[PDB]
Each structure stands twice: as C-alpha cells, then as structure tokens.
Amino acid sequence: APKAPADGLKMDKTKQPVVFNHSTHKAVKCGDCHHPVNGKEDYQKCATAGCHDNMDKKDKSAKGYLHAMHDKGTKFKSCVGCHLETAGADAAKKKELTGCKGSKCHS
Numbered sequence: 001a002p003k004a005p006a007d008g009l010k011m012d013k014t015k016q017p018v019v020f021n022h023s024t025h026k027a028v029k030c031g032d033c034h035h036p037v038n039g040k041e042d043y044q045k046c047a048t049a050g051c052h053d054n055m056d057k058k059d060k061s062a063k064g065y066l067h068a069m070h071d072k073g074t075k076f077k078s079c080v081g082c083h084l085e086t087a088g089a090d091a092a093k094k095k096e097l098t099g100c101k102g103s104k105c106h107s
C-alpha cells in the first residue's frame, strides 16, 4: 500500500501520451487498478518487465499494454471499459471519456 502520486502523471510509452490524475479517481479502490498479482495488489508501473510490456497494438494477452488500457470484457475494468460504464448513454460524457479523438485522453 504505497502512496498515490500527484496529478499530471504522464503515461508516455507511446506517441499518444495520456495524463493520469489520481485525484479524479479517488472514488475508485486502489486495488481495482493496481490489481492482484500472485495474490497481492501490485503497485509497479503497468508496463514493468513481465507485466503489460508489449507495445504491439494487436497483442490482446496479459502482455498487451494497449489492451489493458482500452478493451472491454477484461477481468479488471480498463480505462475505457470503466469510462464506458460511467458515461452510460450520455453522448457528451462518452466523447469526453471514451473518444479516440477529441477526448480527455486523446485530444
């Protein structure tokens, strides 16, 4: 159980970096994102060696970095997956939280 970093955290493993703010996700349990690995919630960087370290856009295994941030039907809600539920039928929120362009993730 480490300490939540300050906002402005830059996820920049790709050419479309995204800023993650812990403050806006205060209502979400730490473990929902820093999920269990070998029985214990893991707080290492998502793309740590052995984790989601493959940058291949088509890798849908546990090694797929982009898969972990965008896809639905995953064991743990991904960024987009959780945002889809949050936005519901609200088209404005869907654009803001799940859009591939013109969203708060990818301008």
Ligand code: HEC
Residues within 6 Å of the ligand: 001, 002, 003, 004, 005, 009, 011, 020, 022, 025, 026, 028, 029, 030, 031, 032, 033, 034, 043, 044, 045, 046, 047
């Ligand atoms: C998802 C909705 C998250 C919630 C809720 C919490 N965190 Fe988080 N955190 C998240 C991401 C996407 C990242 C970036 C990881 C990366 O690959 O760089 C982080 C990062 C951290 C870190 C720093 C990791 C490092 O660089 O070593 C820590 C220590 C951390 N987060 C802690 C933390 C705690 C204690 C939370 C709840 C109280 C918590 N986070 C929630 C995503 C999410």
Ligand code: HEC
Residues within 6 Å of the ligand: 033, 034, 035, 037, 042, 043, 044, 045, 046, 047, 048, 050, 051, 052, 060, 061, 062, 067, 068, 069, 073, 074, 075, 076, 077, 078
């Ligand atoms: C290695 C130590 C990892 C770290 C750090 C993170 N994850 Fe992970 N993830 C890892 C494994 C081995 C697994 C599967 C665990 C299982 O019980 O099956 C996963 C899985 C996910 C998933 C779901 C994948 C799917 O069902 O297709 C997501 C969405 C996911 N992980 C996201 C995620 C994020 C955003 C992380 C950083 C905040 C993160 N994980 C760290 C291994 C490791």
Ligand code: HEC
Residues within 6 Å of the ligand: 018, 019, 020, 021, 024, 025, 028, 032, 033, 069, 077, 078, 079, 080, 082, 083, 086, 093, 104, 105
């Ligand atoms: C739920 C389980 C979530 C996961 C996983 C992630 N996010 Fe999220 N996020 C969530 C909520 C409930 C909200 C607020 C909704 C609203 O209408 O404001 C958000 C908001 C954001 C935002 C906008 C606010 C901001 O910090 O700029 C962004 C850009 C954002 N979230 C990004 C993000 C990323 C990159 C995630 C995975 C790495 C991610 N979120 C996961 C709920 C949840």
Ligand code: HEC
Residues within 6 Å of the ligand: 011, 012, 013, 014, 015, 016, 017, 018, 066, 069, 070, 079, 080, 083, 097, 098, 099, 100, 101, 103, 104, 105, 106
């Ligand atoms: C936040 C909730 C996001 C939304 C909405 C979408 N994406 Fe995303 N994307 C997100 C993260 C956390 C990252 C990684 C940031 C980093 O640099 O580490 C990404 C990355 C991508 C990339 C990589 C670009 C490249 O270099 O090839 C692609 C291709 C991408 N994202 C596509 C994409 C699509 C198709 C989306 C709509 C369905 C979309 N993203 C939304 C977070 C978020």
